């Protein structure tokens, strides 16, 4: 699985969360999102393949993932307390982070 696969795993699990009926279903999908985000964070996106590994752009990319992972953790805390609707709303905001931090490097 590569970065493109990781991104599409995030997309599929966002759909799972949107369609979910219970906290356990949301938790499972957030787990897969967290795993895919950890995998993606270690990749080099195509627009940064020539850039220095410590370039500001590569920092932006990796830090977008630390922010995304922290937000996934906040959503996991909600679904671990049974707060399904709150967790689903939080998952929607994960789209904003993904789009603003990461998409420009794909």
Residue numbers in the entry: 1 to 106
From the study:
We applied our method on two proteins which were previously determined to high resolution and frequently used as fusion partners for GPCR crystallization, cytochrome b562 (BRIL) and Flavodoxin, and verified our prediction by solving the crystal structures of the wild type (WT) proteins and mutants. The theoretical and experimental results both indicated that with relatively lower values of conformational entropy, proteins would be more stable and readily crystallized to higher diffraction resolution.
Compared to WT BRIL, three mutants (T9C-A36C, V16C-A29C, and K27C-A79C) show relatively better or similar diffraction resolution, lower conformational entropy (ΔS) and comparable B-factor. The BRIL proteins with disulfide bonds T9C-A36C and K27C-A79C have lower entropy, consistent with better diffraction qualities. For BRIL proteins, the simulation B-factors are consistent with the experimental values.
